[PDB]
Amino acid sequence: RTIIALETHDVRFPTSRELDGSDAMNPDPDYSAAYVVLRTDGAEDLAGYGLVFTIGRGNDVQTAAVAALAEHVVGLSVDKVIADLGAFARRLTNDSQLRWLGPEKGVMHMAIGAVINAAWDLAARAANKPLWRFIAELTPEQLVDTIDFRYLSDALTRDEALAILRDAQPQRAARTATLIEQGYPAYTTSPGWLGYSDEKLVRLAKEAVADGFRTIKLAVGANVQDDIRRCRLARAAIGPDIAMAVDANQRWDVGPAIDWMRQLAEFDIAWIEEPTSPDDVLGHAAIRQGITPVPVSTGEHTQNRVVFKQLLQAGAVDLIQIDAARVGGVNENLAILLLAAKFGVRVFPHAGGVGLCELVQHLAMADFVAITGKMEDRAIEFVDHLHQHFLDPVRIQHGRYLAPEVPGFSAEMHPASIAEFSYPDGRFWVEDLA
Amino acid sequence: RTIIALETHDVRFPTSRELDGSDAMNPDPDYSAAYVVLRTDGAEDLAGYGLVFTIGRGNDVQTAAVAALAEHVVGLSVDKVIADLGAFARRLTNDSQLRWLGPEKGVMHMAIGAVINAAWDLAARAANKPLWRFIAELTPEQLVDTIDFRYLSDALTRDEALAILRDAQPQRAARTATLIEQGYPAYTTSPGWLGYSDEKLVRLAKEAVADGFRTIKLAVGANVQDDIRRCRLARAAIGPDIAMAVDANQRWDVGPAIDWMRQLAEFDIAWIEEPTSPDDVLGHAAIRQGITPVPVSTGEHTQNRVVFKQLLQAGAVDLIQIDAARVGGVNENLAILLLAAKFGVRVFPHAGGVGLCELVQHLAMADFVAITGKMEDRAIEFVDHLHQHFLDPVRIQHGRYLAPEVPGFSAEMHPASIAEFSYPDGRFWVEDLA
Ligand SMILES: C[C@H](O)[C@@H](O)[C@@H](O)[C@H](O)C(=O)O
Ligand SMILES: C[C@H](O)[C@@H](O)[C@@H](O)[C@H](O)C(=O)O
Ligand SMILES: [Mg+2]
Ligand SMILES: [Mg+2]
């Protein structure tokens, strides 16, 4: 079989109508997907799906970036692609001309990451396995062959990665059983969007705990008085035993972040996410040093494994987020997970976007099985939005993610959803723009 | 007057035909420009020009990113835009949805930077001044009003920037006279492209020195034996008194970079440019610590002022490059120049791309007049390619840049050049692709 087309769609959801996903930096996001399909001349089931998550404006540019990769993939042998995902990723990441648009950052890199992710979806489907098992069941050699070790020789060599993966082999099967029977811890951010009223915040926080979530997260960062008020209300609503994280979405400078967190510390903060710019490694370390022991995290916007390496080297974080679509696809996230494991830093996957819960759950689960063997000390983010648009929506049971069973990356979306929300000619948008 | 249109063009030059611009990372670049025009309903002279520099593939995506900004600018009052370039820049950089595609990095940020640069071109033209004088003659208050101080409070506050600018006021006029009469030091990289034969390297290096350049730069990084051979040949060709820099274009890891430079040190290296990833602040510092006193530089791919801040804080560089199109336009480069001045780090502007000499010369000259008052200790890069396509090509006299005189950013390109090299329907490409 051959990849005969790279199809792209600019799909946007009107989440801003109710301010779902709203925060201090992004006050009215419209969760969007630069959706891509790697089509083949095989069975209808033999296709790869992926998407870049954006929040509205710019999604057309992001979609255009993905479409520009068609000549790089159309015509390739399916067997050749899935048999060497490392070579496939490099075919895109090593194109020096595309690197100039980055390198390995921004629109062009996320576009590359979406095509790479679609290829892993295609591979998992061909293997008749949900992506987490596809990844976790590859041999240590097959796994490191997909990783780009450039710029990491000082922190993680191929031999060091192999050692970590080989050390985990004996328990892979047992952990797979544990995951399937117990699920993976989750936490929810849906009760904390900044655009919600105090009444809605409290109502949703209570429902979240009622649903079994042992941790919730609130957006903060626009007004300290508002944050103090909201954190007090949420803490009172959930009780003293539920963890409560806060997310500043990059709003603060180093000094202000320290002073701001000093005023929220009394409410028992699980961690402060993105207190400052996602590029400020030294800044996060300075903030962490100033507010310790209040935990600091960052990661959903971290451009690539080189920046993650530095965050770990500089001791800028207590835990990190990883994102399925921000970096160079699965290949890059595997490098990041191995770096986090080697440095002994917990990973709390980011999923605050359409389709992100569906995608990222697989990376966290593969990590548990083949890399760390640790999940009760961490959690996968969850947001209660737009799951109805995916063929294999995530399943949460008593605050825990159930392991996916169907083949693939869970990225495939309902054609009806694409038809209704494609921008700007989709049914909803033609009516809305009118 | 009003901005009535944002016109964009995908222009690509076949520099790969002779491997002009070739290096270890980018072996066959096709110097390209994602050209933009801010058109108004005023005089034909009243327009803003700008461009994002890329090396071929991907330029269509970059052009699309710029075109996507039309709704943000079309309809704006020319007087309102030029009277507050800080507000104009923020209108684009503070669009949270566009920030998600970055933030402040990659394709979307460079697109924003090109539109911002076009606005400064428009402003300088309205003022009937070449951009360097337009910038250097603004009051300290007007200058800081254009700067985004977010994420810089720990290294450069508004008051600190004002102090530096005010300290320079007394000598602004005298330095303007000095620049106009003496020119600004330059160095050339055109003799050192990696794709050239040893014979061509030597021939061009000799011509470069004959033309008055006191410094040349060679691309290195693919094969150490080749680098040793080429550096020996170039050094012998130029003599012991001419400075010779080398550029690895991000090829090495930390350890290898140190070992590689140890083998080139005997040829008297002026500086090693981009020894590793443009995102590795800690890595550049480690390399610098290992090869000192051999100077280390980086900057042409540095995504924004936040990364530059860290490079300075971490002592990762001996000198930095700045680039007119890589960051958020003039506004961001002013912040970077002020950071470099405050930290006492020399700036050697990057210009290895089409139109970059034309653009960046203005930033270096404005810096000399209004910020540092230092130029004999540094130099502006020059490449001997494609200047014929610009209405106001740079002028080099005895190895020094002559100060531009015509109004603007020198970005305007000949319509005939655009017609011939527009991709893929331009005259040259239709014939070439055939
Ligand atoms: C705009 C988005 O909803 C963000 O606020 C979201 O990704 C957030 O950072 C999160 O961690 O869930
Ligand atoms: C592809 C380009 O010619 C680069 O090699 C060029 O920008 C180089 O880095 C330089 O500093 O001139
Ligand atoms: Mg977050
Ligand atoms: Mg360079």
Swiss-Prot record, chains A, B:
It catalyses: L-fuconate = 2-dehydro-3-deoxy-L-fuconate + H2O. One of its GO terms (biological process) is carbohydrate catabolic process. Its cofactor is Mg(2+). Binds 1 Mg(2+) ion per subunit. Its EC number is 4.2.1.68. Pfam families: MR_MLE_C, MR_MLE_N. Mg(2+) binds at D247, E273, E300. The active site is at A219, H350. Keywords: Lyase, Magnesium, Metal-binding. SMART domains: MR_MLE (SM00922). Substrate binds at G21, S22, D23, Y31, K217, N249, E273, E300, H350, A351, G352, E381. GO terms for molecular function: hydro-lyase activity; L-fuconate dehydratase activity; magnesium ion binding. Plays a role in the catabolism of L-fucose. Catalyzes the dehydration of L-fuconate to 2-keto-3-deoxy-L-fuconate by the abstraction of the 2-proton to generate an enediolate intermediate that is stabilized by the magnesium ion. L-fuconate is the preferred substrate with 15-fold lower activity observed for L-galactonate and 8-fold lower activity with D-arabinonate. No activity detected with D-fuconate. Can also catalyze the epimerization of L-talonate and D-ribonate, but at slow rates. Belongs to the mandelate racemase/muconate lactonizing enzyme family. Homodimer. This is L-fuconate dehydratase. It comes from Xanthomonas campestris pv. campestris (strain ATCC 33913 / DSM 3586 / NCPPB 528 / LMG 568 / P 25). The lineage of its organism: Bacteria, Pseudomonadati, Pseudomonadota, Gammaproteobacteria, Lysobacterales.
